[PDB]
Structure 1
Amino acid sequence: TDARLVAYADCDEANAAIGAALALGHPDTQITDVLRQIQNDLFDAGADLSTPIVENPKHPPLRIAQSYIDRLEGWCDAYNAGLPALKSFVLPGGSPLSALLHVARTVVRRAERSAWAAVDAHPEGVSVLPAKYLNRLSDLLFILSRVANPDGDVLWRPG
C-alpha cells in the first residue's frame, strides 16, 4: 500500500491498457512502434517510482530522464499538426483503436496522480520525472485517439 508501490502498480495498469489498444485496435506500423516505445518507457517509469533515490554510484540508474519527456512532447506536436481544430469537447470513443486509447489515457491520468502522490510522500527520494512523463503521455494518447478517428471524433453537445 506504500505510495511508491501504488504508483508503480498504476504504471503497470496503464501499460496493460496500451497493450490492449495494440492487440485489439489494429494500429498501423508507425503508431504501433510509437506505442511499443511507450510500453518500454512505462516499464522504466514503474522501476523508477518503485526504487528509492539513493546516492548510489555503483549501479546503472533505471530512471525516467528529461529526454523521455522531450520525445513525447515532440510526438505530440508532430501528430497534432495533421489534425483540425476542435469544434467542441471530445467524448471518449469512436473507432476501436480510438476508444482503447481513450481508456489508456484515463488510466495514465490515474497513474499520474499516484506518481505525484509518491513525490509528496517522499520529496527527496522520489523523482518528479515519472509524473511529468505520465502528464505528457495523456496528451499524446488524446492526440492519437483523434488520429485514429479519421471520420471525426465523438463530440459533446450542450443540448
Structure 2
Amino acid sequence: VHLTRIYTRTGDDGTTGLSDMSRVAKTDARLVAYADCDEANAAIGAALALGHPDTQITDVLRQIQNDLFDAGADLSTPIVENPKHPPLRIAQSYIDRLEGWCDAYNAGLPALKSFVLPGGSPLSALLHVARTVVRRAERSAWAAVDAHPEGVSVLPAKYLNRLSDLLFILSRVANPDGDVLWRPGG
C-alpha cells in the first residue's frame, strides 16, 4: 500500500480495482462490503477522538480498527486455489478475541429488560453510532458472500457480527450512571 498523489483518475469511468488489480463496477457487492468496513472504521475513529475513552478501551478500539483493515484486505482479495503468496485473511482467532472482550466487559453489567435509548456520555453515543454502522457493514458482507460463495470468505461477516455486540457492551460501560430504556408504546 502506497498513498502518494491519492487522486489517480482511474475510477472516473465508474470502475475500480480489487486487490488483485481485477476491475469491478463501483456498485460491486465486494466493494460495497469493504467500503462499509471503512465507514465503520471512521465511526470508531469518531468515538476515539470525540468520546475520549480511557486507555484500556482505547486499546481495544484501536485493535478493532486494525482488524477492520484486515477484513477489508480479505474482502477485496478474491479467494483463489493455490495463490502465489498467502493472502491476509480473517481467522476464527479474531472472533474468539472479540468474544473474550464481550465476556470481560459484560461481566460487571446487569441484564436489561428492554432496549437502550442511545445517548448519555459522548462516548456511549458514538459507540452506538459505530455499532449501527458496523451492523450495516455486516449486511453488506453477507451480500458479498451471496454474490461470490466461493470467492469471498464468511469470516469477515462473522467478525462484524460479533463486533457490533461488543460495541453495544462497550456503550453500556461508557454510561456508568445507567441507560434510559425503551418503554414500548410509552
- TM-score normalised by structure 1 residue count: 0.97
Give the C-alpha shift of residue 91 in structure 1.
Answer: 1.5
Render the CA deviation track for 1:71-108: whole Å, top value 9, x for unaligned: 00110011101111114221122110000000000000
Structure with higher Rg: it is 2
Between the aligned partners of 1:144 and 1:26, the Cα distance in structure 2 is: 13
Give the C-alpha shift of residue 60 in structure 1.
Answer: 2.8
User: Does the 8 A contact of 2:40 with 2:134 survive in 1?
Assistant: yes
Give the C-alpha shift of residue 57 in structure 1.
Answer: 3.6
Render the CA deviation track for 1:16-65: whole Å, top value 9, x for unaligned: 00000000001000000000000000001011111110123421321110
Between the aligned partners of 2:180 and 2:124, the Cα distance in structure 1 is: 10
User: Does the 8 A contact of 2:138 with 2:157 survive in 1?
Assistant: yes
RMSD over equivalenced CA pairs, Å: 0.9
Runs of 4+ with >3 A deviation: none
Q: 3-state SS of the aligned residue for 1:76? A: helix
Q: Identity, % of aligned pairs?
A: 100
Give 1:117's aligned residue: 143
Between the aligned partners of 1:122 and 1:71, the Cα distance in structure 2 is: 27
Greater CA deviation, 49-58 or 109-118? Answer: 49-58
Q: Superposition pairs for residues 1-159 of structure 1, below 5 Å?
A: 1-158=27-184, 159=186
Render the CA deviation track for 1:99-135: whole Å, top value 9, x for unaligned: 0000000000000000000000000010000000000
Q: 3-state SS of the aligned residue for 1:88? A: coil
Paired residue total: 159
Structure 1 residues not aligned, in runs of 5+: none
Give the C-alpha shift of residue 2 in structure 1.
Answer: 0.5
Give the C-alpha shift of residue 154 in structure 1.
Answer: 2.1
Greater CA deviation, 87-96 or 123-132? Answer: 87-96
Between the aligned partners of 1:110 and 1:130, the Cα distance in structure 2 is: 13
Give the C-alpha shift of residue 7 in structure 1.
Answer: 0.1
- TM-score normalised by structure 2 residue count: 0.83
Between the aligned partners of 2:170 and 2:61, the Cα distance in structure 1 is: 10
Between the aligned partners of 1:122 and 1:87, the Cα distance in structure 2 is: 39
